[PDB]
C-alpha cells in the first residue's frame, strides 16, 4: 500500500508501450492486419516515444541539462547551508573566535588603560 | 574578414630614445623587438589580432572573443561590430566599474 501508485504507474508504462506495439486489429481479425503489414513491407522492400532530435536541438537539450545540474547543485548547497545543524556549527565556531578575540581585546584595553594612566601621570 | 578591414592597428617604429634604460624605448618595448606619432612615430596598419580565447585553468573553461581596436577609431564601427558580428543584443543597462588600478 505504500508502493501502490508507483507500481501502478510502472505497469502503466509497460502496458502502454505493449499496446502501442500491437497491430490495429484484434487477434481474431489479426490475419488481415498481418496481411496488410506483409503487403506494405512487400511494397516498400522489393520496389512512439522516441523522438529523433536534430543537432542544434540536441545542443540546446544538453545546455538545458547542464543548467539543471547547476541549479540542482546550487539548491542542494543552499539547503545544506540553511540546515539547522550547519547553522549551529558555524555559529559555535564563530563564537569560539569571539571568545578568543574578545579576550585579546580585553588584554589590549587593559594595556591601553595603563598607558593612558601613565600619560595622565606624565601630564 | 570585415573585422580586419574596419578597425586599425598601431605598430611602434621610432628613433628608440634611451631615456633611463636604453633597451626600453618611449613605448617601453625591447630595443630589437620593434617591427600616436608624437615621440613614437606610429603608422596605421590593418588589424591582425581578433578571434576567440580558450581560458584553461582557474576553474571552468570560458570562451571570450577579442578584437584588437586602435584607440583612435570611430565608435559606430565598434557598435555595429558588437551588435552584428558578436550577436549581442542591446542592454538595458551599462554598469561601468571604474575604480582603482
Amino acid at each position: 500500500k505504500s508502493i501502490s501508485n508507483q507500481v501502478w504507474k510502472f505497469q502503466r508504462y509497460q502496458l502502454i508501450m505493449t499496446f502501442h506495439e500491437r497491430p490495429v486489429l484484434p487477434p481474431p481479425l489479426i490475419i488481415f492486419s498481418h496481411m496488410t503489414m506483409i503487403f506494405q513491407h512487400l511494397c516498400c522492400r522489393w520496389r512512439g516515444l522516441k523522438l529523433f532530435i536534430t543537432d542544434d536541438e540536441l545542443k540546446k537539450v544538453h545546455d538545458f541539462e547542464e543548467q539543471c545540474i547547476e541549479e540542482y547543485f546550487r539548491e542542494k548547497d543552499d539547503r545544506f547551508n540553511s540546515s539547522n545543524d550547519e547553522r549551529i556549527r558555524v555559529t559555535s565556531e564563530r563564537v569560539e573566535n569571539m571568545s578568543m578575540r574578545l579576550e585579546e581585546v580585553n588584554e589590549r584595553e587593559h594595556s591601553m588603560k595603563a598607558s593612558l594612566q601613565t600619560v595622565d601621570i606624565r601630564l | 574578414s570585415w573585422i580586419e578591414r574596419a578597425f586599425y592597428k598601431r605598430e611602434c617604429v621610432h628613433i628608440i630614445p634611451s631615456t633611463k634604460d636604453p633597451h626600453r624605448c618611449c613605448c617601453g618595448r625591447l630595443i630589437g623587438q620593434h617591427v600616436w606619432s608624437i615621440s613614437k612615430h606610429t603608422q596605421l596598419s590593418p588589424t591582425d589580432a581578433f578571434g576567440t580565447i580558450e581560458f584553461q585553468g582557474g576553474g571552468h573553461s570560458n570562451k571570450a572573443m577579442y578584437v584588437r581596436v586602435s584607440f583612435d577609431t570611430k565608435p559606430d564601427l565598434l557598435l555595429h561590430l558588437m551588435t552584428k558580428e558578436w550577436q549581442l543584443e542591446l542592454p538595458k543597462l551599462l554598469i561601468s566599474v571604474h575604480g582603482g588600478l
Partner: protein, 557 residues
C-alpha cells in the same frame, strides 16, 4: 624558560604538529626537559593520546633524580617528582625516546646543542628510501626563543643543505620579531628606516636586550633575511601549523614538481598542493600532469582529480583506450567485484590470475548487468576492429561517460558522483549507474559475497536513482517541453535507448511516477484523440458505432 600562550593557539599548534607527525611518520626533536616549548609539546601529545618518535635531546646534568637513571638495561622508576624550588627539571613523561647529553657537569646548559645539530645534519645526509627530495628532510619549528634562536636560525639557513625554518608568531620573543620583520622585509634588507628603528627599539626594550648588541643582532637578522625563501611564517586566523610544516617540507627539498605532486598524493593533503605545488612558474614536463592524473585516478583521490581538472588536463585528450584499460586493471585502490564479474561473463561466453581485463570484456560485463537488449558500445563491431587494429581514433568523444562506467564498476562512489557532475547526458548516466549498481548488488547477493558489499551497492543505486529523480524534478520545474524532449530522445551513447527505457530496466518506480513521464504516457495513450472527459466509454461507443467517431474531438496537426 617557561612561557604561556593563547589556549587555542596552543591547541591548533598541537593538532597541526600531531597531524603532520602522523602524515609523515616524523621524529620530533623536542628539547625534553619540561620547561617552555617542551611543555607545549607534552600538551600536544596529550591531544593525540594514541609510530611517532619524540626523541628528546636533553642534558644529563640538569635532569632530576640522576641516581634513578643509573642502571644497565634496567626498567628504572622515574616519577613526576618536580620540586618547585629545585634547579633540576624533570623530563617530559610521555616522550617516546630520550638522549642524555653528558659533558660531565651538572645544571649547565649548552651540553646538547652541538650534538643535536650534528645529529640533525647526519640524519639529513642519509639518503631516504623514496629519494623524492635530498635525503631525509628536516624542518625547524620555532616558538619564542632568545638570541640563540636567531643564531640557530642563521645556522639552519646557511647550512648545506639549507634546511627550512618555520616560525610561529603570536608568541613574542624572537619569533614575533622575525615575523614582523619578514612581513616588511621585501628583498631581505629592503626595510624602511622607521620600521628598522621600531624593530631595534622593540629589541632593546620590549624583549629587554642590550642596546649595544641590538645592532649586532640586527645585522645577524639581516644575514638570516638574506635567505628569506626558506623562512616560512604562520598567521593564525582550521588553518593549523601542519600546512606550514608540509609547505616547508616540499619547499626545502630541491625536488621537481611531479615528485612534489606524488608526495602530495601520498599524504592526501590537497590544500598543500593547491597552495604551493600548483603555482605560477612551475614547469610541468610533457605528460607529467596526465601521469599525475592517472595516479590520482587509480588511487581514488577525487579532490586531486578536481584540482588537476581545475588546472587543466584536457579530459578528452588524456583518456585513451590503453589509459582506460590500465585504469580497469589497476589494484592500487579500493577493492571491487570486477574480477568475479569478468570470470562469470567469460565462463558464460565460452581464468588465469594474470588476466588483462580488456575493454571488450568490460563491455560484455555492461551487457550482462544492464540486461535485456542493451548492446554496449565496446562490443560493437567498429570498436572491436579498432581494438584489434591497435592491440584521434583512440580517444573518446564523451570521456565522462566511460569514466562514470569505470567508477561505478569499481565501486568508487565519490569519483562516480564527481564524474556525474561533469559532462553531458547526466540523467542517462544516473539511470545507467542506478541499474549497474543494483545489478552488481544482485550479483553479489546471489553469489553470497560480503553483505556490506551488496548493501553498499544497493545504497549506491538508491543514491543514483535519487539523483535522477531530483534532476527530473528540476528539469520539470524549469521547462516542461524541454523536459519532454530530455526524457524521450534517442541516446546514441547508451545503445539507442531513451531515459524512460533506462528507468524501466532499472525498475525505477520513483522515476516513472513523476508528472513528466505520466504526461508523456497519457499523450501517447490517447494518440491523436483529444478525448478529455469520460474517455473509455466514448472509445467503446466509437468501436461499436463507427458513425460516433465523427462526433469526436480530434487534435490539430
Amino acid at each position: 624558560q617557561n612561557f604561556e600562550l593563547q589556549p587555542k593557539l596552543k591547541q591548533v599548534f598541537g593538532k597541526g604538529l600531531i597531524k603532520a607527525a602522523m602524515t609523515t611518520g616524523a621524529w620530533i626533536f623536542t628539547g625534553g626537559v619540561n620547561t617552555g616549548v617542551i611543555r607545549h609539546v607534552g600538551d600536544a601529545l596529550k591531544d593525540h593520546a594514541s609510530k611517532i618518535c619524540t626523541i628528546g635531546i636533553a642534558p644529563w646534568g640538569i635532569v632530576e633524580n640522576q641516581e634513578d637513571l643509573i642502571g644497565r638495561d634496567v626498567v628504572r622508576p622515574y616519577q613526576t617528582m618536580s620540586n618547585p624550588m629545585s634547579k633540576l627539571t624533570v623530563l617530559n613523561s610521555m616522550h617516546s625516546h630520550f638522549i642524555l647529553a653528558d659533558n660531565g657537569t651538572t645544571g649547565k646548559y649548552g651540553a646538547e646543542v652541538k650534538l643535536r645539530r650534528q645529529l640533525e645534519k647526519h640524519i639529513s645526509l642519509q639518503k631516504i628510501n623514496t629519494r623524492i627530495g635530498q635525503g631525509v628532510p628536516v624542518v625547524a619549528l620555532i616558538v619564542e626563543g632568545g638570541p640563540n634562536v636567531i643564531s640557530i636560525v642563521l645556522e639552519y639557513l646557511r647550512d648545506t643543505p639549507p634546511v627550512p625554518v618555520v616560525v610561529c608568531d603570536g608568541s613574542g620573543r624572537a619569533s614575533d620579531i622575525l615575523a614582523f620583520g619578514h612581513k616588511y622585509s621585501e628583498e631581505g634588507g629592503l626595510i624602511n628606516e622607521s620600521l628598522r628603528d621600531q624593530l631595534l627599539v622593540t629589541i632593546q626594550k620590549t624583549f629587554t636586550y642590550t642596546r649595544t648588541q641590538a645592532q649586532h643582532l640586527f645585522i645577524i637578522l639581516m644575514e638570516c633575511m638574506k635567505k628569506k625563501e626558506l623562512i616560512t611564517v604562520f598567521r593564525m586566523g582550521h588553518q593549523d601549523i601542519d600546512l606550514a610544516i608540509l609547505t616547508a617540507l616540499l619547499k626545502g627539498a630541491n625536488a621537481s614538481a611531479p615528485d612534489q605532486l606524488s608526495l602530495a598524493l601520498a599524504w592526501n593533503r590537497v590544500d598543500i598542493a593547491r597552495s604551493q605545488i600548483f603555482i605560477y612558474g612551475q614547469q610541468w614536463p610533457v605528460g607529467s600532469l596526465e601521469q599525475a592524473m592517472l595516479d590520482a585516478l587509480v588511487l581514488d583521490r577525487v579532490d586531486f582529480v578536481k584540482l588537476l581538472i581545475e588546472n587543466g588536463v584536457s579530459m578528452h585528450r588524456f583518456l585513451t583506450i590503453s589509459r582506460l584499460e590500465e585504469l580497469y586493471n589497476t589494484r592500487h585502490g579500493p577493492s571491487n567485484t570486477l574480477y568475479h564479474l569478468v570470470r562469470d561473463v567469460k565462463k558464460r561466453e565460452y581464468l588465469p590470475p594474470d588476466y588483462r581485463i580488456s575493454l571488450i570484456d568490460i563491455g560484455l560485463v555492461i551487457e550482462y548487468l544492464m540486461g535485456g537488449a542493451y548492446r554496449c558500445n565496446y562490443t560493437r563491431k567498429r570498436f572491436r576492429t579498432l581494438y584489434h587494429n591497435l592491440f584521434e581514433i583512440n580517444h573518446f568523444p564523451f570521456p565522462f561517460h566511460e569514466l562514470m562506467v569505470w567508477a561505478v564498476l569499481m565501486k568508487r562512489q565519490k569519483m562516480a558522483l564527481f564524474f556525474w557532475q561533469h559532462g553531458e547526458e547526466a540523467m542517462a548516466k544516473a539511470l545507467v549507474a542506478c541499474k549497474l549498481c543494483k545489478a552488481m548488488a544482485h550479483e553479489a547477493s546471489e553469489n553470497d559475497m560480503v553483505d556490506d558489499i551488496s548493501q553498499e551497492l544497493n545504497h549506491n543505486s538508491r543514491d543514483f536513482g535519487q539523483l535522477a529523480v531530483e534532476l527530473l524534478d528540476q528539469s520539470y520545474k524549469q521547462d516542461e517541453q524541454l523536459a519532454m524532449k530530455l526524457l524521450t530522445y534517442e541516446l546514441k551513447n547508451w545503445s539507442n535507448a531513451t531515459c524512460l527505457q533506462l528507468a524501466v530496466a532499472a525498475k525505477h518506480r520513483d522515476f516513472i511516477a513523476h508528472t513528466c513521464s505520466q504526461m508523456l504516457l497519457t499523450d501517447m495513450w490517447m494518440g491523436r484523440l483529444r478525448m478529455r472527459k469520460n474517455s473509455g466509454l466514448k472509445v467503446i461507443l466509437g468501436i461499436l458505432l463507427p458513425p460516433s467517431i465523427l462526433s469526436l474531438e480530434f487534435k490539430n496537426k
